[PDB]
Amino acid sequence: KXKK
Amino acid sequence: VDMYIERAGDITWEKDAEVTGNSPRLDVALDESGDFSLV
Amino acid sequence: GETTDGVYRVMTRRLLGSTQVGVGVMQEGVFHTMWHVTKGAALRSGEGRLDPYWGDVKQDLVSYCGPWKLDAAWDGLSEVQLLAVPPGERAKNIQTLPGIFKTKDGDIGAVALDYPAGTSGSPILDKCGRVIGLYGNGVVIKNGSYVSAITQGKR
Numbered sequence: 001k002x003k004k
Numbered sequence: 005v006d007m008y009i010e011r012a013g014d015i016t017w018e019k020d021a022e023v024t025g026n027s028p029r030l031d032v033a034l035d036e037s038g039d040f041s042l043v
Numbered sequence: 044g045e046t047t048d049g050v051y052r053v054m055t056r057r058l059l060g061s062t063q064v065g066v067g068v069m070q071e072g073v074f075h076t077m078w079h080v081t082k083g084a085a086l087r088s089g090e091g092r093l094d095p096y097w098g099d100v101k102q103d104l105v106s107y108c109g110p111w112k113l114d115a116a117w118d119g120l121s122e123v124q125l126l127a128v129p130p131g132e133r134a135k136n137i138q139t140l141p142g143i144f145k146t147k148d149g150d151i152g153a154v155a156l157d158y159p160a161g162t163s164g165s166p167i168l169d170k171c172g173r174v175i176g177l178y179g180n181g182v183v184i185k186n187g188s189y190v191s192a193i194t195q196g197k198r
Contacts, residue, residue, distance in 0.1 A: 001157070001183055001189045015168065021137070023138040027155070033146060035101075037100055038101050
């Protein structure tokens with residue numbers, strides 16, 4: 001994720 | 005705040021594409037605010 | 044022409060540079076994205092305004108200008124493609140076999156692909172090019188990698  | 009959209013391409017399936025990633029089998033829960041969590 | 048079919052970046056700007064906060068799908072005059080991208084707020088498209096129409100924070104989805112139009116479903120069997128539109132990078136197709144989110148209310152396809160947060164809303168496609176869901180609501184597993192639900196609304 002760079003949870004969204 | 006200026007929230008705006010910009011076109012980024014056509015939606016098309018790519019023939020002969022790199023297939024990658026695994027396929028996990030997870031037990032999860034979803035709460036009323038849209039959060040998924042591992043169970 | 045502010046609602047021509049396609050995939051779009053969702054951007055924010057203040058007095059300085061722009062930031063890509065997500066991605067969405069324009070289909071049949073309706074813009075589709077994930078709730079956490081826009082927080083359900085209005086969008087500008089050129090000189091025009093797109094107003095929120097339908098949404099659900101539990102599904103983490105929102106539609107603009109009309110009801111949710113995307114109705115194709117993962118068949119539970121076939122490989123799919125993420126049409127990833129990452130910040131500052133061109134749209135790219137990534138093919139994968141989904142895994143599964145097993146929940147008390149049933150199974151959901153899930154893709155194990157990792158992208159920046161602003162890739163949220165990128166569409167997931169079946170072999171006919173239909174959008175079977177949007178990427179970007181998921182979990183982080185033990186090793187720090189990511190698994191996204193294939194999030195689809197009800198048409």
